[PDB]
Symmetry: C3
Subunit: 443 residues, 3 copies
Amino acid sequence: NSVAYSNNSIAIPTNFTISVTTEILPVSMTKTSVDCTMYICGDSTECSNLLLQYGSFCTQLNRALTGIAVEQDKNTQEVFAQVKQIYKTPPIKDFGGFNFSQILPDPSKPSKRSFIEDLLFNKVTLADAGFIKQYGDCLGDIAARDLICAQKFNGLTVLPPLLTDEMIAQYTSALLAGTITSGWTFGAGAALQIPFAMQMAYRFNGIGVTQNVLYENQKLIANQFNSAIGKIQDSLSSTASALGKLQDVVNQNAQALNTLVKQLSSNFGAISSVLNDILSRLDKVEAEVQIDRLITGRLQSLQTYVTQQLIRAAEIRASANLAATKMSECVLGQSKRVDFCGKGYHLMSFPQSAPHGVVFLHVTYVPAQEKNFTTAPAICHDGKAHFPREGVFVSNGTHWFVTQRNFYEPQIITTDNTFVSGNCDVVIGIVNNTVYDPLQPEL
Amino acid sequence: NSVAYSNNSIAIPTNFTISVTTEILPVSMTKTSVDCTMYICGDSTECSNLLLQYGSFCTQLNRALTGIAVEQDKNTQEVFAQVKQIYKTPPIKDFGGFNFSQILPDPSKPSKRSFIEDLLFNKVTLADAGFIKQYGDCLGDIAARDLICAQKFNGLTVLPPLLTDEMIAQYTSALLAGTITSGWTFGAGAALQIPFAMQMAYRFNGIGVTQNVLYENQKLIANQFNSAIGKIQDSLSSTASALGKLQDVVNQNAQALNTLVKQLSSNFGAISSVLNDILSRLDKVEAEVQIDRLITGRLQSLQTYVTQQLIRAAEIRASANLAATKMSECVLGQSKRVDFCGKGYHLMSFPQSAPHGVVFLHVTYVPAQEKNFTTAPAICHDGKAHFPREGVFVSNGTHWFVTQRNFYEPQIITTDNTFVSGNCDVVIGIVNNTVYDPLQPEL
Amino acid sequence: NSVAYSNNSIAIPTNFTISVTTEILPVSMTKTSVDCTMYICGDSTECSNLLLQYGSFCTQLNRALTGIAVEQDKNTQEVFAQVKQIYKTPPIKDFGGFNFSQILPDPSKPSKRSFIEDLLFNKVTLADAGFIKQYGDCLGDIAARDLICAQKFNGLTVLPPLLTDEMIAQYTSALLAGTITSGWTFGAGAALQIPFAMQMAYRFNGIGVTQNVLYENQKLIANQFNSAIGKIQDSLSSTASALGKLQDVVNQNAQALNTLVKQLSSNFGAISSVLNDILSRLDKVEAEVQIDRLITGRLQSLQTYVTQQLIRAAEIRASANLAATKMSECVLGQSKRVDFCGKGYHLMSFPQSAPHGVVFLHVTYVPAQEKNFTTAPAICHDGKAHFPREGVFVSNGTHWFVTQRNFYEPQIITTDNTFVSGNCDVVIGIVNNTVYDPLQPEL
Ligand SMILES: *[C@@H]1O[C@H](CO)[C@@H](O)[C@H](O)[C@H]1NC(C)=O
Ligand SMILES: *[C@@H]1O[C@H](CO)[C@@H](O)[C@H](O)[C@H]1NC(C)=O
Ligand SMILES: *[C@@H]1O[C@H](CO)[C@@H](O)[C@H](O)[C@H]1NC(C)=O
Ligand SMILES: *[C@@H]1O[C@H](CO)[C@@H](O)[C@H](O)[C@H]1NC(C)=O
Ligand SMILES: *[C@@H]1O[C@H](CO)[C@@H](O)[C@H](O)[C@H]1NC(C)=O
Ligand SMILES: *[C@@H]1O[C@H](CO)[C@@H](O)[C@H](O)[C@H]1NC(C)=O
Ligand SMILES: *[C@@H]1O[C@H](CO)[C@@H](O)[C@H](O)[C@H]1NC(C)=O
Ligand SMILES: *[C@@H]1O[C@H](CO)[C@@H](O)[C@H](O)[C@H]1NC(C)=O
Ligand SMILES: *[C@@H]1O[C@H](CO)[C@@H](O)[C@H](O)[C@H]1NC(C)=O
Ligand SMILES: *[C@@H]1O[C@H](CO)[C@@H](O)[C@H](O)[C@H]1NC(C)=O
Ligand SMILES: *[C@@H]1O[C@H](CO)[C@@H](O)[C@H](O)[C@H]1NC(C)=O
Ligand SMILES: *[C@@H]1O[C@H](CO)[C@@H](O)[C@H](O)[C@H]1NC(C)=O
Ligand SMILES: *[C@@H]1O[C@H](CO)[C@@H](O)[C@H](O)[C@H]1NC(C)=O
Ligand SMILES: *[C@@H]1O[C@H](CO)[C@@H](O)[C@H](O)[C@H]1NC(C)=O
Ligand SMILES: *[C@@H]1O[C@H](CO)[C@@H](O)[C@H](O)[C@H]1NC(C)=O
Ligand SMILES: *[C@@H]1O[C@H](CO)[C@@H](O)[C@H](O)[C@H]1NC(C)=O
Ligand SMILES: *[C@@H]1O[C@H](CO)[C@@H](O)[C@H](O)[C@H]1NC(C)=O
Ligand SMILES: *[C@@H]1O[C@H](CO)[C@@H](O)[C@H](O)[C@H]1NC(C)=O
């Protein structure tokens, strides 16, 4: 506000020089297209395959670059469909049909008491009726010690049936003596044959008791052998049956184990195949995500490029409007605007064609020599502050004149050159001068 | 079209007032940079690590914000490479080397017929030659019942060798009687010794047949014992061999089962490790995708911000062009345009520097009091419709004058103030007036 | 440069025609909002659920479309949080507690030497004392061949106790003869009883040796039976113990196998559940990535649409500024610009309201008939090259005049109509003419 009355210097030209100026204004823009495939993906196959799933955004970008507005609507052309091509998992069978059999888990608690008394079947054979060590040592080699040292039993008298040479000789001699005395004696002289019959009966009783002992021993051996053979047969049959049952159980367990091994191999193969497929899918997904990240980054870069191109197109349309108005105001007319039809005061302009632009040949005159003059916003001649019309107030140091800003022509301040505006109070900046008015035409 | 002759009121100013106006026009813009790391990721490490894979789009955004165009080319700087750091799967071994052995699967069908006839080896011993219950009950205690009740055989006569006291006494008495009668009789009186020899021979035959029976029984027992012992030895050896084979089979199966358990533990550990790695990778991928979604959203927001900044830069360049033309038309000249160098009719302007802008001090005069006047597009003075040049037609109610739109100065309609245009037929809006032309200069 | 003096033709109008022109200039824009949910997702639920994770970018887009700048700050509203809702893996138990027992793995190497000598326990019974085939064939049916063919032993004489009818008859006859001769002879006539006692003693010795052989055979059978029964009992007990131990081992192995099968089923079920969950998560991630790709593409399309809308808003603001300056220069004043307030030289303009725009009714006069004239940049009248001010130099073929570019009025070239500029050397294009200056006012 205070700079209004600061009597700033105004440059008023004095001389001019004709100058020719050439100006180029862009009107149209070269049609720029964008190939998103080559921009986002540089000679990459998987990149293009993944970009094919991003949609038809490149078509919208190209239509926006050509000058066609992008439509705002719903998804009547793009579908988020899925096919679910996932494979079915191989059947991992359950291990429930494997029943390993035992031998005697719980057979109603039989508890069979065998009680094999095979050791108790021993033959404790009874001895003989004697005459084994007593008679054998008492007789010796003397036949006279046969009758006087004859062994006996608990209620009988026994003698061994083994005779000797001297024994039978003495027996024959006694028999002959008895037979001789029987034919010559009437009393008891024939008693010599009594000991013969006595020892004969004793040997008979000995043979009988030995035969009885042997028969009892044979009966004992027979019954003991029968019982032992029966028990051995029973034990062997039971052992064979138990061994057969155990062998059947072992064979069943072995078959079940073979089947289990086969099913286990099948299940492990299925699990391995599933794991391999899962790992392949994981690797594919990781690679696809790592590619999509860079795809998104390059899409942001391409969107920035498209924004730049659209802003450039808008600026070129503005420059085309400027070229049209410059044509209308410089070629079809003489503009009074300063530094519009070139640089200076316009005289005449000529248009020239150009690729994507218009060339203007501006013929104007520039101020050769300029002089600074002290100016004021208004003067005051006894009130009624006057401001200049079609020109500015110019002072050379002592006098004030009115002239236009293009050329210096000092003219006296008259009423026909200025306009009154109120009084000299509101107008900031007041100088006192005299407004003459001759109005005297000559000739 | 019909509004042309609607005699619309035009505001013609009458008085003016000097006014000073200040205008600020932006020329340059403060250099704005974008830090994508801090904008997309607010103090987040994994966000920045994932953004590092999106590429160098931030460089292109900053270059676009600085005024450098984004290049449209292929991918000569970004590669979609991969290293495939996936680990190798632990070997899940197959269960094919486990062959559980059986005992007798198919040994060419031996079918060994044992036929153990151990029960048939019983000793059915034959009885004696009698004299066990018949002779024992017939004899009793009377020696006279020995010869008259003597038992016999099928073709012989047998007697037990067991004698008695009265029996041997009677035998001795008969022998003595026979020996006595032999020495006194010449005929058959010596027949008393016949029954003695008869019973002696009978006892001898009895001893012989008992010895034969015992010998046959001993032979039977011997052969039966030999056969039974042979069969028992065979059965025991076969049972021991079968038990040893079964024990070897069980031991082999147990070793195979231990090996199977070890291999099964190894395979399950490998599968568990693979599953843990797969789960970790899945969690990582899910987290990365969830982060990348918000990263893409914030990238869209940042792209919108960059678009706004670029449009603001374009508008500021347009405002700089406007400031340049305003400088040229207001400071270097006095513009005749209304409300361009401020607000009103321009007199003088002064430039002032400012940060990122130019300040203009416009000195102009605004219309103080305005008056509405009825105007017409053209008049008609006996044909040859006249339209005003350097001014408009203004009527105060009865008379029509010519004046400029900035100040009210009624002037008479003359030929030097108007221009003829055809006739009064095509021009829409026709009023009849008189175009005077004194052309009389005084003094 | 060379086209300046090319005497190009300038079109100077001669007649005019009043024309009314209507112009529409957009000022404001209809408030456009963007619904990202319906644009990116067309009637899709999972698409909207996934877009909800992209953030509040739609709010920023709408605020930018409304005219509010997008803020550039850190992430004080969006968090990249995670909850880690991953399930815990079912415990895959290890197979370490399964200890399959053997029978005799390494029991300090007992190596028990059984050495069952059951075959060596045979009864090789000794024969009798003869008289089985020799005496039986030598005796026959003649009692006389009994004493003369009597068998003997190695040191004794034995005879079988089996007599015959003729044998006992001859014995009785010899005994009777001896008893008769004993009573009538004094010498050795009683020797007839010697062979009787001899054969009696021989039969006694035979019975004795047969009894001894039978007793020895019974002792042999007894000891052999005892030893064989002991060995058989030992073997049976050992076999039963080994069979019981093997049965216990088989039962333990079967129980361990059942437990192993149960644990294996549990582990396989756990692995199957884990694999199913992993497959479900993989399918979900794949579908989500395939949706996010198209979401990103449509987001790029929407960003392009927003950029277009913002550029249109900027252009509409520029058109509003143009409408304001056209209002100020055509309605509030008469502009001297050609083809600015319509098409032609402006006379008066009238404003009319319109939805989102201002309608201008421009009243102007267009050049009816135009004539081409040869123009020059400057003339030369004895040096001091003159260029026209407020008009251009126009020649009709022989004479040069000064006139304005809007109407054809030939005026004589005077000093008050031209300006001197240096000399006729620098000014490109020089023509020689005469600059008159009458300055003679009449009347
Ligand atoms: C006004 O005039 C004074 C007197 O010489 C001078 O000092 C001052 O600089 C002038 N103001 C301008 C040129 O703005
Ligand atoms: C095996 O079979 C037996 C009888 O056939 C039955 O009692 C048992 O429950 C079964 N065990 C299994 C695991 O099927
Ligand atoms: C007029 O004033 C300007 C203001 O800086 C100055 O640059 C110029 O040299 C001055 N001209 C003369 C002739 O003094
Ligand atoms: C200013 O112009 C007047 C008018 O011609 C003249 O008399 C005077 O000498 C000039 N110079 C000064 C310093 O006043
Ligand atoms: C306003 O204009 C009228 C027109 O004649 C004039 O008489 C009057 O003095 C003016 N007033 C001011 C304050 O300029
Ligand atoms: C102009 O004249 C008035 C009237 O006397 C006076 O008040 C004022 O100070 C004068 N101004 C100048 C600059 O001489
Ligand atoms: C034209 O003049 C008539 C007569 O008073 C008036 O009613 C009408 O409003 C005028 N038309 C305008 C001012 O546009
Ligand atoms: C086991 O071995 C036997 C003979 O050694 C053979 O016949 C059989 O096919 C084998 N079984 C397996 C499953 O290898
Ligand atoms: C001139 O006409 C305009 C049109 O609305 C009106 O606003 C204004 O008040 C009028 N002025 C006079 C002095 O009648
Ligand atoms: C209009 O102007 C004329 C010309 O001076 C004048 O005679 C007349 O009184 C004014 N007013 C009317 C209503 O005509
Ligand atoms: C066209 O201009 C010529 C120039 O003298 C004039 O004679 C003629 O009447 C004009 N015609 C029209 C229709 O304005
Ligand atoms: C002007 O005069 C002509 C010639 O008689 C006549 O036809 C026309 O109606 C008049 N117009 C007016 C507005 O008086
Ligand atoms: C200049 O005048 C010559 C002479 O007729 C003519 O051939 C040439 O075309 C003119 N140059 C123009 C019209 O630019
Ligand atoms: C099984 O147990 C035995 C003794 O109880 C031991 O020596 C052996 O190492 C064990 N084996 C396993 C695999 O635990
Ligand atoms: C004036 O020159 C232009 C330039 O091509 C031409 O189109 C037009 O017809 C010419 N007019 C006359 C009247 O020769
Ligand atoms: C050109 O204008 C002059 C000046 O009136 C005139 O004498 C002449 O006949 C016109 N035509 C030519 C061809 O000079
Ligand atoms: C510059 O202007 C002065 C002002 O009188 C004049 O005398 C001189 O001749 C001019 N010089 C040129 C080269 O125009
Ligand atoms: C103009 O006159 C000068 C002075 O004699 C002469 O040198 C020049 O050639 C003339 N130019 C023309 C176009 O006649």
